Structures are given as C-alpha cells and as structure tokens.
Amino acid sequence: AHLTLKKKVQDSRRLVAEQLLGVSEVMADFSREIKREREQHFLQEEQIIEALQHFGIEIQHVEIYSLEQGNIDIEMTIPFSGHGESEKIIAPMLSDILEEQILVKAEQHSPHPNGYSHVAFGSTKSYRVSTGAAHAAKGGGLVSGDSYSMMELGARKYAAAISDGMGNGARAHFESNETIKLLEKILESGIDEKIAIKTINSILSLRTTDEIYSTLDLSIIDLQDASCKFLKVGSTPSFIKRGDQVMKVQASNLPIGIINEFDVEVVSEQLKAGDLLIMMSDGIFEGPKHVENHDLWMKRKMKGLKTNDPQEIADLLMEEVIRTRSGQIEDDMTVVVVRIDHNTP
Amino acid sequence: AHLTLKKKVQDSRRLVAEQLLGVSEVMADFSREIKREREQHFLQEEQIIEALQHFGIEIQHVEIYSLEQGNIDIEMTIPFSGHEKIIAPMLSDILEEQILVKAEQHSPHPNGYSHVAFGSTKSYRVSTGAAHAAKGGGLVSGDSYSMMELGARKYAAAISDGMGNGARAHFESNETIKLLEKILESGIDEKIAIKTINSILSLRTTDEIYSTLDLSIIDLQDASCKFLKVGSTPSFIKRGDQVMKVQASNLPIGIINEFDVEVVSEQLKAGDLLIMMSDGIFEGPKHVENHDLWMKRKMKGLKTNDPQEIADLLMEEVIRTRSGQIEDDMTVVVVRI
C-alpha cells in the first residue's frame, strides 16, 4: 500500500539480476567445493607416494587410475617375494587413506624366476541394497505426473528420489521428469548433498510463484555405516520399517523454487540390517478418500506386510490404497522400497 | 577404443562435473559483467552530482531513480528562473544517447517551486505481428515465440523449435523462451547472454539435445541488428524488393559446439521488414528444391507493409503447396521499422 511508481521496468530489471546473482553465488560456491575435493585427493595422492618410498617396498611399477573416497582404485606391480607381504603393505595404505578400508587383489602371472606380480587394490562396500517400486498414473494411462529414480553411485551410497508437482497429465511430467534428470547428474558429481539441493533449488527458481516447480523427496543410504540422509524438499512424508515398528520421518520446508529462505534442513536416521525404507508421494499417503488419520493408516498397513522382498512391499501398499476405492485412482501414485542387509562375503 | 574401461562411472562422473563447472564459469562471468555495469552506473552517478552542484541553481534535492543506458530517468528541483540548457552538458558526460526536456512550472508565482524530469529518447518505431500453427492443426504446438520490448533501447524476438511432436516439444520450447525472457531482461551483453542460456540447457551430452533458438535484437538507437542463430535457422530481410538472407554455421543449443556462438550484425533503415520463421515454414513446401529461392519469390509477391498481414499471408501460402496439410509446427514473426 504505497505510491504509484509506474516506471517499474527498472525495478524488475534490477530485481531479476539479484535472482541471477543469487544463483551465480551457489554456482561459485559449488565450484569452490568441487575444487576443494580436487585438492584433497591431490594431497592424498602426494602423501601416498612418499609413504611408499619410506616403507621397505618396491616401486617396480605403479599406476593411479582414480582416488575417490567411495571408489578407491589403484594398481601396483611388485616383485614376487613371498608370504603375506602383498597384504601387510596394505595396512599403511588403509591408514594413509585415513578413513577407508582397502582390500587386495593380487594377480601373479610369472611361472619363472623373474618377478612379474601385478596387483590391484579396491575399496570395500558393506550392506547390500535391494530395490523395487510401484508406479501408477491418475487416469492409469501412459505417463504419470510423479517421477522417481534410484541408481548407485559407485561403492558408497545408493540414491532414491521422488518428485511430484502439478496434477495435470502432461503439464506435470515434463516438469517433474526434468528435476530428477537434473538431480541425477548433480548427485553423480559427488558433491555434498546439502549443497546439491540448494544448487538444484537455485537453478529451478523461475517466475517467483508459489509452489512453482517439482516437489522432491531424496533419501541417500550410505553403505559405510548404514546411515541415511533424509532430504525433504517436497514436504512428502516417508517411513522406515524394522520388524514391526514403523518410524515416521518428516521435515518442515516448502517446495522447490525460491519459496523459502535459509535453504533446506537435513534429517539423519540410523538403521541396521534387514530394515525397510519405504517412500511414497502425496498420491499414496493421501490416497484413500475415506481416511482421517493417514499416519496410523499407513503404519498399520505395514505391520500387516509379512515379507522382506522390496518389490512386493511396494505393490502390496500400492494396491491396498487402490482397494480403499472402487479401483479408482484420484491422484498420481508412486512408492519406492529399499532394503538393507550385509554382504557376508 | 582403448581398454575395456571397467569403472567408467568414475571417468563418466568427472566429465559430468566439468560440464557443471563450465556453466558455473559463465555464471561467475555473468556476475562480473553486471557488476561492471553496476560500477559504471555508480561511477557515472558520482560524476553526475558534482556536475549538478556547480550551478547557480544548486543540487537541492535531486533524485536519480535509475540510470541504465536505455532508461534514463532523473528528477530535479530548480528555482523558477526563466528562459533545458542544463541538459546539453548532462548528455555529454554520459557519453551516449540523447536527452530531452520535460519541465513543468507549477505555482505561477514568484516562489521557487519548480519540478523537472528528464528522459531518454528512442528512435525508429517498431511494429509487430506473428502467426501460429500446430503440427496436427491442434491446440498444442511444438514451436513457441515471444516478442517484448526491453524499455527504450531494443525490441526482441525469439523463436524456438525443438522436437517434431506436439507434446514432447511444447515443454522444451516454452521453457527456452521463458528462461530467455529473464536472462535478457537483466541487462547484459547479448553475446554473453547466449552462452548463459546454452550452458544451463546442457543435459545428457546428446546430439541436438534441446530447443534450437533464433534471436533477433533490433537496436532502436541507430537501427542496428544483432542476428543470433542457434540451429542454422535462416531468416530474411525485405527492403522494397530486395530479399537478404542471414544465416550462421553454428549447431543447436546444448554443448554441441565449442568456442560458443558467432555474432552477426546488420544495418537496416526505415521501412525494412524483418521476417523470421522456424524449420516448419522454411521447409514448409515439400515439393521444392531451393527453399531460399522459393521463399524469395513469395516475399516479392507480398504487397503490404502491415507486419500482421505479412505473417498470415505468408503462412497461408505455404499451406497451398500442400493439400491443406500441416506436416510440422509452423511459426513466423514479422517486424517493421
């Protein structure tokens, strides 16, 4: 409730600049963070070659292909020698990485007095992951307004994202499918997840509307110690099932765009082997039209599930929401399940 | 190739990272370019207040609302005085454009009440017109266009195509122009504004990934034009009876080319007609070898200067080459000076 100020084109021009300066800040903040990751691995590489010279080990042949904390892969070649010397030179190799355990793969191919022993070292992963999902559209036809994806990023972590958006058929998929495709590439870079969401949230800021773009739900399970990073930027609830318990995780923040200041909060939970992480969109959680308490209804539905296969769990919950109606589907429905259990190699 | 590249996921993610550093590079360069203009507007502002002070009227309460080379608008307060001569030097220190007067003398009394406002001057009036059509002749077309004015200095016109189908391409075309409508509005170098759009739209590292673009910028200062073409989409200029075609060798939007986009400049005068079309109109007539010579004879047959009629009478004539069929999305934009 102010004056007129009808010469407002300049006020819009300089305001759009701050939108372009704001996103340029998170891009520069992303550039210095990835450069910091380049300097750590480079410093780790220098520290590794000095440690070899000092310890009584032979530098007959060496090749370093890549050195990420998740995907550790280096190759060496040393004289044949004898006994457990191929692995007791690895004890300092674990300590030089300071964080990761290293295993040995020794390929000795020289049935002659001359020494030709080629060896490769790789990272170790714990907790094997099993996946499965169920998909459904509002009209049950062709393409749904909800999009999901779940891919593994090397050895360390398994990712799972779900995006919603608008309710229209074509108007919501092209906007929801693009979010996951943009997230599927930014998460592949190996950047901090809390920063990766601000970077996606900044790029997708368009028109300065309310609830502009695709809401999203990201869950990343670290295989190092079976920890999870619950990132909710779509305000969609998620659940964890351990035997017969059902623990609900939720977070306060608004959809993707520039709807909130001071970005997105992270939520962490600790799980063990045999646990079941199920996620759904708003079409399943608010699916049944004749239900008041959607939290108790979703908890009791899982306690009746008597299986550990993640594929069946996604379907028995999906069709149970359909059972509450006369086969009706009043909204786009999507559910993703992930199970955790050790490798036991 | 080389080895069997077992753990390519490491080599494939370092490449995706470098793609994301490239767009982060032009974004930091975009920030330094607008900061350069913000330091230019600030350095000129300090240059203004000392020149305004040295005068028998004193600065009093001068108000500078905004000072970009396109929209110059400032207000001052001066004594009643009598017989605008303070604006001829005010135009010289800014070193560009021209300034007009707008001084209204309120209170016809020997008081010192007198408000004044100064604004930029624009030359060469623009006239617009376009024609729209869908692939199946339906409601949803794969081509999207827009033509808005950015203050006083320039009139813009963009056309994007993309895929052939109506649904898969309507989102990619509508998104390109909406993203272009915000990057051009910020006020930045046109050559750098294109590398900003193309870097953001780099996704999946495919061939001919996203929407091809056709940008035409008409400067109202001296009637110069900046032809920016991403996708080798031809355009034409009509002056009386001449038909000049502009083209560029660069490839569609994405990261399909290195060393960014070449800029093309042209000089036009009054009465000229800038027409633009997508690949659905230029390749409209299917039983034609030379699409350029065919399009040239069609414009010499156009006998009107109304930009709206030119867009329809050219589009409807492309339909006549077929049996009323529309084999692809069609879009044409006409601009007169």
Author numbering:
A (entry chain A): 465 to 809
B (entry chain B): 465 to 547, 551 to 804
What does the paper say about this structure?
We investigated the PP2C family member SpoIIE, which controls the activation of the cell-specific transcription factor σF during the developmental process of sporulation in the bacterium Bacillus subtilis. SpoIIE is the most upstream member of a three-protein pathway that activates σF in the small cell. It does so by dephosphorylating the phosphoprotein SpoIIAA-P. Dephosphorylated SpoIIAA, in turn, displaces σF from the anti-sigma factor SpoIIAB to release the free and active transcription factor. Like other PP2C family phosphatases, the catalytic center of SpoIIE uses two divalent cations (manganese in the case of SpoIIE) to deprotonate a water molecule that serves as the nucleophile for dephosphorylation.
This construct produced monodisperse protein that yielded crystals. Despite limited (3.9 Å) resolution of the diffraction data, the overall secondary structure elements were well-defined in electron density maps for both the regulatory and the phosphatase domains. The five molecules of SpoIIE457-827 in the asymmetric unit were paired in similar dimers; two dimers were formed within the asymmetric unit and the fifth molecule dimerized across a crystallographic two-fold axis. The core of the dimer interface (1500–2000 Å2 buried surface per monomer) was formed from antiparallel contacts between the long α-helices from the regulatory domains of adjacent molecules. The effect of these substitutions on stabilization and subcellular localization was investigated by use of a SpoIIE-YFP fusion and the effect on phosphatase activity was judged by use of a σF-dependent reporter (red circles). Comparison of the SpoIIE590–827 structures with SpoIIE457–827 revealed that dimerization rotated the switch helices (α1 and α2 of the PP2C fold, corresponding to SpoIIE residues 630–678) approximately 45° as a rigid body relative to the phosphatase core. In the dimer, the switch helices are held in position by intramolecular contacts with the long α-helix of the regulatory domain and intermolecular contacts between switch helices across the dimer interface.
